[PDB]
Scaffold this active site. Structure first.
Site, PDB file in Angstrom:
ATOM      1  CG  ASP A 213      11.302  -5.143   4.808  1.00 40.08           C
ATOM      2  OD1 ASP A 213      10.173  -5.430   4.401  1.00 40.08           O
ATOM      3  OD2 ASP A 213      12.017  -4.270   4.281  1.00 40.08           O
TER       4      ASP A 213
ATOM      5  CG  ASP B 287       6.813  -5.100   2.263  1.00 37.87           C
ATOM      6  OD1 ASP B 287       7.666  -5.464   3.090  1.00 37.87           O
ATOM      7  OD2 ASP B 287       6.951  -4.100   1.528  1.00 37.87           O
TER       8      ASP B 287
HETATM    9  C1  0LT Z   1       4.783  -3.330   9.988  1.00 43.35           C
HETATM   10  O1  0LT Z   1       5.789  -2.557  10.660  1.00 43.35           O
HETATM   11  C2  0LT Z   1       7.038  -2.469   9.944  1.00 43.35           C
HETATM   12  C3  0LT Z   1       7.567  -1.010   9.958  1.00 43.35           C
HETATM   13  C4  0LT Z   1       6.601   0.014   9.297  1.00 43.35           C
HETATM   14  O2  0LT Z   1       7.081   1.390   9.339  1.00 43.35           O
HETATM   15  C5  0LT Z   1       7.955   1.962   8.401  1.00 43.35           C
HETATM   16  C6  0LT Z   1       8.405   1.248   7.264  1.00 43.35           C
HETATM   17  C7  0LT Z   1       9.285   1.864   6.357  1.00 43.35           C
HETATM   18  C8  0LT Z   1       9.645   1.111   5.101  1.00 43.35           C
HETATM   19  O3  0LT Z   1       8.898   1.482   4.194  1.00 43.35           O
HETATM   20  N1  0LT Z   1      10.546   0.078   4.988  1.00 43.35           N
HETATM   21  C9  0LT Z   1      10.793  -0.549   3.668  1.00 43.35           C
HETATM   22  C10 0LT Z   1       9.568  -1.027   2.825  1.00 43.35           C
HETATM   23  C11 0LT Z   1       8.851  -2.273   3.406  1.00 43.35           C
HETATM   24  N2  0LT Z   1       9.547  -3.437   2.801  1.00 43.35           N
HETATM   25  C12 0LT Z   1      10.469  -2.954   1.742  1.00 43.35           C
HETATM   26  C13 0LT Z   1       9.979  -1.511   1.408  1.00 43.35           C
HETATM   27  C14 0LT Z   1       8.925  -1.326   0.264  1.00 43.35           C
HETATM   28  C15 0LT Z   1       9.416  -1.987  -1.034  1.00 43.35           C
HETATM   29  C16 0LT Z   1      10.163  -1.224  -1.959  1.00 43.35           C
HETATM   30  C17 0LT Z   1      10.659  -1.827  -3.131  1.00 43.35           C
HETATM   31  C18 0LT Z   1      10.400  -3.187  -3.394  1.00 43.35           C
HETATM   32  C19 0LT Z   1       9.680  -3.961  -2.466  1.00 43.35           C
HETATM   33  C20 0LT Z   1       9.165  -3.355  -1.306  1.00 43.35           C
HETATM   34  C21 0LT Z   1      11.439  -0.257   6.108  1.00 43.35           C
HETATM   35  C22 0LT Z   1      11.296  -1.577   6.914  1.00 43.35           C
HETATM   36  C23 0LT Z   1      12.854   0.388   5.956  1.00 43.35           C
HETATM   37  C24 0LT Z   1       9.675   3.206   6.517  1.00 43.35           C
HETATM   38  C25 0LT Z   1       9.235   3.925   7.637  1.00 43.35           C
HETATM   39  C26 0LT Z   1       8.362   3.313   8.579  1.00 43.35           C
HETATM   40  O4  0LT Z   1       7.860   4.027   9.682  1.00 43.35           O
HETATM   41  C27 0LT Z   1       8.379   5.318  10.065  1.00 43.35           C
END
Ligand code: 0LT
Ligand code: NAG
Length: 335
Positions: free
Chosen positions: A37, A221
């Site tokens: 990430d 991202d």
């Molecule tokens: C492409 O494949 C990767 C996995 C995709 O699937 C999933 C991904 C996630 C998910 O959202 N994140 C965190 C996001 C992404 N970067 C930080 C944040 C956003 C943000 C918030 C605040 C500031 C900046 C960014 C993860 C990694 C915990 C949850 C459930 C998933 O599936 C069930």
């Protein structure tokens, strides 16, 4: 310090939505499926110390510190607030194996893992590729710890995300893999160090630059499944595409999919264009079925947000290089 080493981590592509690799924690190693990430800076895995009442923990690999001979205690509380859901636990130190590199790393042992969204996760945890500036509890991120070893050929890392029994994707630490891109990289410098965010000059639906007219922010991202904008940007975009809101996504009648216009993202010099084949989950061509789009609304909170997020939908078309040395992101057409 720079060396010669480039290390690669093979990724698994789960339904074009989740891309994860494998890391090993402890002596003997306990393996975890992890998302690399760029949108976060903390490493975390579910803990053996997670209650069996968080059903997420029942369906994921847990880290047992009592089985690791290299574990060092810390115990500081950690709350990681993503905008899809929230995790909390405590800090631990152990040896992490990532594609051939062994690094002593401070990570979070997650003890509160909510069913939504973690019951849907194919991955167990996360490896944050973001900067220290965004690290909860000011924990040194893994890349900074790997950079310190002075082994990497370059102070860069690259993402290749394939389209769904082949290679799901690949991260290369210390450089890029020319087998996965063609042409030349085009760089866009970071607005500021600390976040993998670049200035976006406009978003055009069709021939006309309908959105981001007076400029906007674009977060690259790798941990995000889709291309995302604010609720309002997505509303305008979706009206232009003719999509209907459905609660968690946006759909079009399946037959209408191929006919949808190209969407272009103005980044640096170049226009990065996605055709309807690049953003529609074309599961059918039926007028009687609804097809989801790989563009979702996502309101990232300040200071990073409001921002667009260029996730797996974008990275699939454009191989991405993240330059820690020159505080820039490079893109080339993926193969
Ligand atoms: C492409 O494949 C990767 C996995 C995709 O699937 C999933 C991904 C996630 C998910 O959202 N994140 C965190 C996001 C992404 N970067 C930080 C944040 C956003 C943000 C918030 C605040 C500031 C900046 C960014 C993860 C990694 C915990 C949850 C459930 C998933 O599936 C069930
Ligand atoms: C936990 O780790 C930090 C460094 O990340 C350190 O400064 C702190 O003193 C540690 N606390 C304990 C209880 O070991």
């Amino acid at each position: 310090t720079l060396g010669n080493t480039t290390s690669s981590v093979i990724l698994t592509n789960y339904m074009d939505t989740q891309y994860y690799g494998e890391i090993g924690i402890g002596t003997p190693p306990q393996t975890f499926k992890v998302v690399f990430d760029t949108g976060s800076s903390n490493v975390w895995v579910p803990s053996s110390k997670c209650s069996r009442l968080y059903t997420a923990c029942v369906y994921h690999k847990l880290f047992d510190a009592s089985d690791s001979s290299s574990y060092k205690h810390n115990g500081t509380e950690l709350t990681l607030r993503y905008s899809t859901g929230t995790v909390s636990g405590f800090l631990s130190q152990d040896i992490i194996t990532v594609g051939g590199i062994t690094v002593t790393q401070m990570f979070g042992e997650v003890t509160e893992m909510p069913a939504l969204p973690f019951m849907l996760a194919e991955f167990d945890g996360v490896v944050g590729m973001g900067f220290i500036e965004q690290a909860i509890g000011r924990v040194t991120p893994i890349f900074d710890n790997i950079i310190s070893q002075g082994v990497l050929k370059e102070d860069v890392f690259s993402f290749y995300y394939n389209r769904d029994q082949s290679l799901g994707g690949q991260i290369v630490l210390g450089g890029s893999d020319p087998q996965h891109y063609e042409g030349n990289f085009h760089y866009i410098n970071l607005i500021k160090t600390g976040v993998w965010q670049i200035q976006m000059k406009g978003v055009s639906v069709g021939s006309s630059t309908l959105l981001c007219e007076d400029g906007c922010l674009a977060l690259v991202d790798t941990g995000a499944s889709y291309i995302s904008g604010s609720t309002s940007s997505i509303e305008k975009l979706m009206e232009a595409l003719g999509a209907k809101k459905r609660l968690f996504d946006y759909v079009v009648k399946c037959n209408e999919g191929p006919t949808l216009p190209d969407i272009s993202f103005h980044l640096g010099g170049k226009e990065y264009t996605l055709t309807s084949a690049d953003y529609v989950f074309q599961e059918s061509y039926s007028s009687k079925k609804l097809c989801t789009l790989a563009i979702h609304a996502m309101d990232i909170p300040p200071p990073t947000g409001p921002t667009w997020a260029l996730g797996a939908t974008f990275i699939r078309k454009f191989y991405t290089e993240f330059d820690r040395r020159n505080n820039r992101i490079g893109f080339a057409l993926a193969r």
